[PDB]
Amino acid sequence: NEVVTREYTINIHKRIHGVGFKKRAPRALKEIRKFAMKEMGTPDVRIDTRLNKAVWAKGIRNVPYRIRVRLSRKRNEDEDSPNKLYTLVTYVPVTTFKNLQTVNVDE
Amino acid sequence: VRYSLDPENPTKSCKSRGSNLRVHFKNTRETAQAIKGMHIRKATKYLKDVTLKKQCVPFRRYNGGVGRCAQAKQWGWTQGRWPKKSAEFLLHMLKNAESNAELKGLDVDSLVIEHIQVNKAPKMRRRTYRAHGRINPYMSSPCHIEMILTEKE
Amino acid sequence: SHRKFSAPRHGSLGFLPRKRSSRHRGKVKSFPKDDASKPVHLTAFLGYKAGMTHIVREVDRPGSKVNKKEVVEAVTIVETPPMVVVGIVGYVETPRGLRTFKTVFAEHISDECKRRFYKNWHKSKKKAFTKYCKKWQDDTGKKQLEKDFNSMKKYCQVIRIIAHTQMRLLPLRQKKAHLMEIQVNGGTVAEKLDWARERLEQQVPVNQVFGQDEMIDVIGVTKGKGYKGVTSRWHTKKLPRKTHRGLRKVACIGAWHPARVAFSVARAGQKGYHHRTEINKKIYKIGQGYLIKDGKLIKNNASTDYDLSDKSINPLGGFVHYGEVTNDFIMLKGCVVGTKKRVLTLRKSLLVQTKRRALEKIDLKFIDTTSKFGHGRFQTMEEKKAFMGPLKKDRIAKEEGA
Amino acid sequence: SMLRLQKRLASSVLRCGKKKVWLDPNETNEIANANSRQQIRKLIKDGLIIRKPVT
RNA sequence: CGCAGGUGCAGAUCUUGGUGGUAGUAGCAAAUAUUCAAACGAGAACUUUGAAGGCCGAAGUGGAGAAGGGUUCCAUGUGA
RNA sequence: UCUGGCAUGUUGGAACAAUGUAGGUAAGGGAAGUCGGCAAGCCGGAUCCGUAACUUCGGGAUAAGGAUUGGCUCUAAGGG
């Protein structure tokens, strides 16, 4: 199975811990890219602009502790790039993070 | 023109060179030395790995102030770096040599880099401003590179 | 000219090289002197530093101001699961020193001990000792083993056991066992060999090596602290505030005429991760470790004969940066070298213990078990639940269930 | 392509600053063709160039 | 064979030019800060567009002039 | 902060060692440091009280010393 969508909770708090004030939001974006690469093995990770807004919503210092994202492996044949498969990361707005498991998504 | 060395037999060899290349001579000399003697496919794979920082070039002669990395043990050495510009320039020249081999009818899957040398090209002059109203030289160190590949298997 | 006012030098040259230790495991550099009249016994053991807590005891030194009075003493807990004997080493005395004569290994060696023989166990085929073990089964190989024990009997003066720790029982990420040579003291070389042979492949608990209220030596590697200046490494005086080019340094690193920096001058460099041997650490307790009896788990470690709290040596929330202690442990007075999880070497004393402090018999009245993850104030979870009362999370659970 | 000229031209035509000028990101090719103030005026009337509201 | 010299260099902190080791070293640390996506393109951390997060905070990092500069102004193209 | 302007001031990535530059904090003492309180720290606004010696009668004077200060709901007075 190549095309697959899953929902995750990423603990930005424990991946940001210790980094400087002027670098917390910029580093949180690179941590989401690393998370997407490890979960779905594609080195081509694309982050939706709405997810970029969610990370920066409180500035460069006070990044949200937890973010709920949707990872979506799709074919890169639309671009015919050297990398065959790519992952798109979108933002999932939630009210609470309690009891939120990693969930398979189908349509 | 004239190369430093003549191939053992010119029929089974291809040549490729370049002049006044804006790469650091000291970095390219070490990269060429690591490339020397290697098969053309293994040299192409190695130079791409130098770009990705997966394999390193051992800095043996021009090593003053060079850091120490784990990948240098593969070369029996302690100091190594990842000269990206030198690896790109040598990748371009390897592609040129491979195209010359195809033109004259040599199989490219048995090609060995038997000769490679880098020479200091004429320097280019710029300036830096150095306090108390002084101007100091700010020079580049380009290089000529030539390689001879020979069929060997 | 002379130093205006005298002051003792900063630091000691007895620990001079002040480098990173070449070994991670502590090394016994001198075993206790052998006495043939004493029974056969081991002289060292391997443990792991779990954490520190404090105890309450009443002292029994008559002329002191704390005589018959209750005192609080810091202690360290060293988790010591049993060791497995896997080999025997023989040594001969030569005018050039002690030389390794012959070593013999057991037939079956566990995978955790074999892990010590590889740098990449994942890529290995696990072929270590696969031909040696076949010698224990073959008839020709069995004769060679008997001859090799006989040569050790008639030629060796020192006999040691190769033993390893069981890291299955420890709550550590690492799965590779620590191997060690432990010298066998007492008896004759023949009696040492017979003792070694019969408990080959067997388990040696820590209670058969050390006893209660005895004073032992702890060998290990100090906590690492990286590159440090002379102010922290050697504790030199800080230069005044208005100093140019640096306060935290030694002003004069030598006189003119010797024309060299001497080795006795404080310089910046590596601090910590030093091999050290502290010598007088008393055993306050030897814990029993968790055991299942009649289907119920016994947690009674660290319950004295004055509290009977039915608690464990484990503090509330567990030891910090170390898992739960479920095996036998040694409680030592004071502090010991190393980080948490650091492997410690415990060996018997080289000295004769005759002072009152070393001979006194200690009996704990209380053992602190409050959380070390903050300002803990409850010894047990049952005590905390009784004091606090029902909480919202308990009522929510009751609502969900009903 | 580069739209430095068009952001300057729409700024002068709309009588606003260049920070209030909006060029449609999906119509870059058509906007790049506009090299006159009069074509900028047509793009404004077509909605391809918009004056953003004040903050 | 004779005739005549601006006739022999290791030095002169010598003169002019060229080149090393140092050395792939010192360094590219004053004024809070960047991120996501797309477009053109052989090639993008740095160009442009859009969306975010920030700064100058009207004695401005704004809008205009005097001296001085002299085409640096504007469009198109190139990337030595 | 808005209008307007910008892309952090001739580069970026990773790490968070010593020494440093810049900014802080510190138990108990309280200048014992040092040539020297250098440096830092204390005080600091406004309202209501209260202010010495000395004096060229002008001052010294914010001398010194003390109290108050938030939010909310009211009341009284002050005009065309």
Residue C276, CA distances (Å) to C28, C77, C279, C385 in order: 10, 19, 10, 44
Residues 12-51 of D with CB under 7 A from strand E: 21-25, 28, 35
Q: Burial, C3: exposed, middle or buried (Cβ in 10 Å; 0-12, 13-18, 19+)?
A: exposed
Q: How far is the CA of C139 from the C1' of F64 (A)?
A: 109
Terminal Cα distance for chain B, rounded: 28
The CA distance from B121 to C232, in Å, is 51
- 3-state SS class at B14: strand
Residue (of C222, C228, C249) closest to C342 by Cα position:
C222
Residue (of A100, A93, A102) closest to A39 by Cα position:
A102
Can you give the length of chain C in residues?
402
For residue D14, the one-letter residue type is: L
Q: Is strand E in 7 Å reach of the CB of B68?
A: no
Q: How far is the CA of D17 from the C1' of E61 (A)?
A: 16
Residue (of C59, C79, C83, C52) closest to C301 by Cα position:
C79
Specify whether the CB–CB gap between C188 and C36 falls below 8 A.
yes
Specify whether the CB–CB gap between C365 and C58 falls below 8 A.
yes
Give the resolution value in Å. Answer: 2.5
Specify whether the CB–CB gap between A86 and A74 falls below 8 A.
yes
The CA distance from A28 to A10, in Å, is 10
Neighbours of chain B (3+ CB pairs under 8 A): none
Largest CA distance in chain C: 90
The CA distance from C211 to C215, in Å, is 9
Q: How far is the CA of D19 from the C1' of F7 (A)?
A: 14
For C373, the token pair is 């993850």
Residue (of C147, C29, C57, C79) closest to C287 by Cα position:
C79
Q: How far is the CA of A85 from the C1' of E35 (A)?
A: 24
For C216, the token pair is 């032992």
3-state secondary structure chain C: CCCCCCCCCCCCHHHCCCCCCCCCCCCCCCCCCCCCCCCCEECEEEEEEEEEEEEEEEECCCCCCCECCEEEEEEEEEECCCEEEEEEEEEEEECCEEEEEEEEECCCCCHHHHHHHCCCCCCCCCCCCCCCHHHHCCHHHHHHHHHHHHHHHHHCCEEEEEEEECCCCCCCCCCCCCEEEEEEECCCHHHHHHHHHHCCCCEECHHHCCCCCCEEEEEEECCEEEEECHHHHCCCCCCCCCCCCCCCCCCCCCCCCCCCCCCCCCCCEEEECCEEEEEEEEEEEECCCCEEECCEEECCCCCCCCCCCCCCCCCCCCCCCCCCCCCCEEEEECCCCCCCCCEEEEECCCCCCCCHHHHCCCCEEEECCCCCCCCCCCCCHHHHHHHHCCCHHHHHHHHHHC
- 3-state SS class at A46: strand
For C132, the token pair is 């040696």
The CA distance from C219 to C279, in Å, is 8
The CA distance from A101 to A91, in Å, is 16
Rg of chain D taking only CA atoms, in angstroms: 10
- The protein footprint on chain F, as nucleotides within 7 A of a CB, is 1-6, 14, 16-21, 33, 36, 38-39
Residue (of C308, C255, C302, C243) closest to C51 by Cα position:
C302
Specify whether the CB–CB gap between C51 and C315 falls below 8 A.
yes
Cite residues whose beta carbon is less than 7 Å from strand F: A 18, 27, 30; C 226-229, 231-232, 240-242, 244-249, 268; D 11, 16-20, 54-55
Specify whether the CB–CB gap between B116 and B16 falls below 8 A.
no
Q: How far is the CA of C4 from the C1' of F41 (A)?
A: 34
For residue B105, give every residue at least 6 positions away whose Cβ sits within 8 Å of its Cβ, in sequence order, or none.
Answer: none
The CA distance from D41 to D9, in Å, is 9
Q: DSSP character for B36?
A: T
Q: Is strand E in 7 Å reach of the CB of B64?
A: yes
Q: Is strand E in 7 Å reach of the CB of A34?
A: no
Q: Is strand E in 7 Å reach of the CB of B120?
A: yes
The CA distance from C149 to C212, in Å, is 35
Q: How far is the CA of C341 from the C1' of E20 (A)?
A: 56
Specify whether the CB–CB gap between A97 and A89 falls below 8 A.
no
Q: DSSP character for A25?
A: H
The CA distance from C370 to C56, in Å, is 14
Residue (of C344, C365, C361) closest to C77 by Cα position:
C344
Q: Which helix (H) or strand (E) holds B39?
A: none
User: In the PDB record, what is the listed experimental method?
Assistant: cryo-EM
Specify whether the CB–CB gap between B145 and B113 falls below 8 A.
no
Q: How far is the CA of A23 from the C1' of F8 (A)?
A: 15
Query: In this structure, how many other beta carbons lie within 10 angstroms of the beta carbon of residue B97?
Result: 21
Q: Burial, B52: exposed, middle or buried (Cβ in 10 Å; 0-12, 13-18, 19+)?
A: exposed
- The protein footprint on chain E, as nucleotides within 7 A of a CB, is 19-20, 22-26, 32-40, 47-54, 74-76
Residue (of B110, B132, B62, B54) closest to B87 by Cα position:
B54
- 3-state SS class at B93: helix
Nucleotide nearest to B62 (CA to C1'): E24
For C76, the token pair is 């360290």
- 3-state SS class at A27: helix
Q: How far is the CA of B26 from the C1' of E27 (A)?
A: 19
